[PDB]
């Protein structure tokens, strides 16, 4: 065999997968603060788009320029209804996803406490 150790720092793409490595070359996972923008990395390091559970509540990490000229994958200050394909969500005044039983515009809904996706039908 032949092997060489390298170092990756910062915002990095391999093919269509986006990673963040910190100063020490160490890959980052989960809910991550990069210079005060918040991001979500899967358990395999790969940056995710969609709604994920954080200490701060369920947040929407979105493609660049979804709202307020946000960065690829950043948490955004979304409010209202959101459809991400077959999955539906509702974001509060506090920019987190609603969970449990809620009345929205005079109709009752239920959103799964574990995913925040609307439970329909």
């Amino acid at each position: 065999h032949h092997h060489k150790g390298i170092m990756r720092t910062g915002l990095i793409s391999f093919e269509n997968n986006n990673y963040y490595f910190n100063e020490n070359g160490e890959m980052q996972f989960g809910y991550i603060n990069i210079e005060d923008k918040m991001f979500y990395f899967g358990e395999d390091g790969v940056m995710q788009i969609g709604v994920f559970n954080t200490p701060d509540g369920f947040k929407y990490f979105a493609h660049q320029n979804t709202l307020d000229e946000n960065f690829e994958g950043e948490s955004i200050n979304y409010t209202g209804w959101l459809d991400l394909d077959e999955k539906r969500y509702y974001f509060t005044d506090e920019y987190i996803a609603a969970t449990g039983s809620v009345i929205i515009d005079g109709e009752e809904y239920y959103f799964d406490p574990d995913t925040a996706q609307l439970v329909i039908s």
Partner: nanobody, 122 residues
């Protein structure tokens, strides 16, 4: 409506120095990763240097240690300090602003300057 203006370009002797300036209007400047690319006639446009919204810089291999990028978020301006200049550094230099993931890549940028000529003589 969105404009990036280069300046500070022009002619310089080898081993000498230049400071490229890019002035941004038409966007929330503090939100973009700002970058510099270069194209020398005969060559493809290549990444040069980039800077995060929080000021963390990164550089192509061949300018590392010689160039220094920086940003003034209060003036909507970014700077490329070019030291120890070489004939290899001769190119049109373009500033760009972007929201895409990897700094090193032309497609990570959505806004582009007109470019300014940097000529270096032996």
């Amino acid at each position: 409506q969105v404009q990036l203006v280069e300046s500070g370009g022009g002619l310089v002797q080898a081993g000498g120095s230049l400071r490229l300036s890019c002035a941004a209007s038409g966007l929330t400047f503090s939100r973009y990763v700002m970058g510099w690319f270069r194209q020398a006639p005969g060559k493809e446009r290549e990444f040069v240097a980039a800077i995060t919204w929080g000021g963390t810089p990164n550089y192509a291999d061949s300018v590392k240690g010689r160039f220094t990028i920086s940003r003034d978020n209060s003036k909507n301006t970014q700077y490329l300090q070019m030291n120890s200049l070489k004939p290899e550094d001769t190119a049109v230099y373009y500033c760009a602003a972007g929201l895409g993931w990897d700094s090193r890549y032309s497609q990570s940028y959505n806004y582009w300057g007109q470019g300014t000529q940097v000529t270096v003589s032996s």
